[PDB]
Amino acid sequence: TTTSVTVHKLLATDGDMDKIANELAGNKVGVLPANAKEIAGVMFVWTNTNNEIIDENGQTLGVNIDPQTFKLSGAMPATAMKKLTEAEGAKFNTANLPAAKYKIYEIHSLSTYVGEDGATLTGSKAVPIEIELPLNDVVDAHVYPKNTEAKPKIDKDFKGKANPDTPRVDKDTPVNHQVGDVVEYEIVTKIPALANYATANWSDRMTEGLAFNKGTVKVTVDDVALEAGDYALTEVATGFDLKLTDAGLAKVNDQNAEKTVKITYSATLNDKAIVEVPESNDVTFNYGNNPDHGNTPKPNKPNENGDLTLTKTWVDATGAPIPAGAEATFDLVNAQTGKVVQTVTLTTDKNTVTVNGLDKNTEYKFVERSIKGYSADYQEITTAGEIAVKNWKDENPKPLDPTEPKVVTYGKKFVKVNDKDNRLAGAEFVIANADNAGQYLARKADKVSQEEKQLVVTTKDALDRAVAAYNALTAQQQTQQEKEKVDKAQAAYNAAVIAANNAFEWVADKDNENVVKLVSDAQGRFEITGLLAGTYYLEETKQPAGYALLTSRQKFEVTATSYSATGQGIEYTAGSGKDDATKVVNKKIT
């Protein structure tokens, strides 16, 4: 008794779609919402309740549509019930159709969305229409489907480099940076047209070797800077949390075009950066038509014995305790490398899981594999070896988590020897950028604390006592025990120097308080860390006892693997097996 069904494609906001919803599938909607626009050129096809494309008499055509992909079995049949919308919609003749349930799908690829004023627009495909005929006592039915939810797009990269559509592919390859370098970052987010977000939050956390620079965050929407009342910015040592306020959400929601949100900020590479170990940041976009309590994973180091424990709690959107919703799966990721180490699953009876045999010096993160209707809230790290997640039944889509670029420092190891190839203590050195003129590698004092500075001084004084006492001994009095005393003293000075070295610079004075001095221990060991790859010149400032002061500077090469590669000339430690250091040969006075 429903002779015709007219399908209308609309591009409207949710609110306008809700104005239509309550005002009726049914009768023609007389007055359409204010800004809601009807679109012509939209291809709709009718199917069986079992998704099979149908003829006008209701007879199947051997081709079916996938409920979630809309990809059809084979060729679009010539006899199929397909019609293109007019600014009046697609009026189909349902007269020959039996009383039954039918579905109406949109073939998005076949459609050319043309708006009210003839403009060729771009929109989201419609949610399939499940309708039963006769549509009560309606002779000429009208159906107003809702469109699908377009996914937002993101990317995190270095300033300029970010692209949400086509993010860079070589992100694992870390950029070489020296200690104290400011790393300029970019987060680019594309928010879809006509969005109705209750929450648009960006969350950034980095590894301990990257120090987020507070007050560098600059947010813009379609290259127009945001007012401070559009977003709420929380800033910490490890990163930040930017959450769009109602004012800022107005600038991204119900827009006629795709919105582009740009987030720029920076972080300084520090003393806690490990040589040839990359440092990363980690962004997540927690969007939703519902308030969202989700954020970015927070990295953490395992405990002393190499154990990292995950704790999980579940709450409704209100924050009230609920039983465990599903089997929560997590990825244990090396927060520096980005590679997945292990995979953990919490069964619905357990709310804790522990990982064993992890490097205590590496940062790891548990990245929850999305649960339908639940949002992951990684709580603030309070201790090593322990990670907490609060799971909120926010009923929102999975967050966006782009791939992040990595940064890395290089080093070089050295061993102080004589011509007989015997190991020497107390030789002191400087690093010059050139053999002729050339400044000396120093610490940026402004960046280094008074306490830090002073420990370098006292640990240097303590080391010279250990070196003097060792030179005081005879060749046979210099036992492994007497050697170890110089090593303990040296290891403390080298630890102090690295700690004070949180920014480098080049200075004229080879004996300026801030000049980086390297001292050879009882095994002749001495290293430099936090450098850009390149050519340097090691200069001797104090010779070892009984040897001559060297007249020429030893040239050296800092590479991506100069600290760790074998085939260098001499073993840096004892029984390490790696031939991971360069010889510095001292000659006797004549």
Numbering used by the authors: 33 to 56, 62 to 627
From the manuscript:
RrgB was crystallized in space group P212121 and the structure was then solved at 2.8 Å resolution by molecular replacement, using the D2–D4 fragment as a search model. D1 makes few contacts with D2, no contacts with D3, and in the crystal structure is offset from the plane formed from D2-D3-D4. The measured mass of RrgB of 64778.40 was ∼51 Da less than the theoretical value of 64829.34, indicating the presence of three isopeptide bonds. This was the same as previously observed for domains D2–D4, and is consistent with the formation of isopeptide bonds between Lys193-Asn318, Lys349-Asn428 and Lys453-Asn623, in domains D2, D3 and D4 respectively. We further show that absence of an internal isopeptide bond in the D1 domain arises because the β-strand carrying the Asn residue is displaced away from the position required for bond formation.
One of the most prominent of these virulence factors is the bacterial pilus; a long, thin proteinaceous filament extending from the cell wall that aids bacterial colonisation in the nasopharynx through epithelial cell binding. The 665-residue major pilin RrgB is solely responsible for the extended nature of the pilus, forming its polymeric shaft, which typically comprises 100–200 tandem RrgB molecules. In S. pneumoniae the genes required for pilus formation are located in the 12 kb rlrA islet and include three genes encoding proteins with the characteristic LPXTG motif. These correspond to the major pilin RrgB and two ancillary pilin proteins, the tip adhesin RrgA and the cell wall anchor protein RrgC.
